[PDB]
């Protein structure tokens, strides 16, 4: 049962209780730059808890380096320790993950875990 490697709930938790004190597990699905003009790349991610997927993840600028290198990848399963929440000006919310863990490599992992279905908002 690979699903039960992922915090199952965690992407509902944050969206609809405003829980910023738990430490889920999640799987990277996606990771994609977003246009910035001449600021720092922003990495913009698609995150599985093995029941939704949700793509307005950020990454702090400062873990940047993660992906650059590599060990932050698609198909890798991190444990979130510290991320906030901002809210824009249309509505959208953005998750912003400030420290992880990676616990598994992509290569370790190799597929997307379960069928995670999208979360609406």
């Known amino acids: 049962h690979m699903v039960g490697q992922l915090s199952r709930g965690a992407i509902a938790a944050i969206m609809q209780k405003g829980d910023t004190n738990i430490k889920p597990i999640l799987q990277v699905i996606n990771i994609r730059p977003i246009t910035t003009g001449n600021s720092p790349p922003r990495y913009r991610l698609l995150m599985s808890d093995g029941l939704n997927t949700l793509s307005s993840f950020m ?6 380096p993660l992906v650059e290198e590599e060990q932050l ?4 399963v991190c ?3 510290r991320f906030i929440v901002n809210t824009l000006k249309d509505g959208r ?5 400030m420290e992880l863990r990676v616990l598994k490599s992509a290569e370790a992992v190799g597929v997307k875990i379960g069928n995670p279905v999208p979360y609406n908002e």
């Open 59 to 64: 990454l702090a600028t400062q873990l940047n």
């Open 73 to 76: 990848s698609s198909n890798c």
């Open 79 to 81: 444990q979130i320790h």
């Open 93 to 97: 919310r953005v998750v912003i993950l």
